[PDB]
């Protein structure tokens, strides 16, 4: 039931997304053992992802949250890197796309730092990099995001350096704590809380 539609450079809607990708990349504290390195990226492509059943079902669950939090979905714009992406956005998120291990709990992580996306785009760690030269810093190779609107409710702050919610929360928000440059990091408990609004494909750029 999925229909990408490409977005044309000229679009605003394509750059308002290019923008949030670009502005959002950091420096990581593994000197780019992850996800490379890199500050900037190549955006090769902004597809829109439609699929009237997945939609739907975000926004049941968006009502839903929204009833239980004063008409309040705290509805956020935040990217997914995961090996998973081309299921997710024909499947929708389920608890097969979270990461079992994560600070927070098994549960499905999202980034406002697209660079912290980025690292788990060939896996966790960047696994072993991209298929083809097993770089998890590849400057050649294609690599995909999701930009997604995720709604959070009511979230836990946690501040720090599947499962369910914490009682009485929708989501978990971590709070960077320790590195100052660091935007926060969120988790949610059920795949209907988050859509794949938009796939980018892109590479990273060597600096100069
Ligand atoms: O790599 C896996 N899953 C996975 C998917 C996404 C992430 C992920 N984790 C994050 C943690 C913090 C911030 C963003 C993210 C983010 O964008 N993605 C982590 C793990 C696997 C599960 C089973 C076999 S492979
Ligand atoms: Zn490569």
């Not at 990349?25 to 992850?34: F, L, P």
């Not at 501040?159 to 988790?187: D, I, K």
């Amino acid at each position: 039931g999925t229909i990408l539609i490409d977005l044309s450079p000229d679009d605003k809607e394509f750059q308002s997304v290019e923008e949030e990708m670009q502005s959002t990349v950091r420096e990581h504290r593994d000197g780019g053992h992850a996800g490379g390195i890199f500050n900037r990226y190549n955006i090769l492509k902004i597809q829109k992802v439609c699929n009237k059943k997945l939609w739907e079902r975000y926004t049941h669950r968006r009502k839903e949250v929204s009833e239980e939090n004063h008409n309040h979905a705290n509805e956020r714009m935040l990217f997914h890197g995961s090996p998973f992406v081309n299921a997710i956005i024909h499947k929708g998120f389920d608890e097969r796309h979270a990461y079992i291990g994560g600070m927070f709990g098994a549960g499905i992580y999202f980034a406002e730092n697209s660079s912290k996306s980025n690292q788990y785009v060939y896996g966790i760690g960047g696994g072993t990099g991209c298929p083809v030269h097993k770089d998890r810093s590849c400057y050649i190779c294609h690599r995909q995001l999701l930009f997604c609107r995720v709604t959070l409710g009511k979230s836990f702050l946690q501040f720090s350096a599947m499962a369910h919610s914490p009682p009485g929360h929708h989501s978990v928000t971590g709070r960077p704590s320790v590195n100052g440059l660091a935007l926060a990091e969120y988790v949610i408990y059920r795949g209907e809380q988050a859509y794949p609004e938009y796939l980018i494909t892109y590479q990273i750029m060597r600096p100069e």
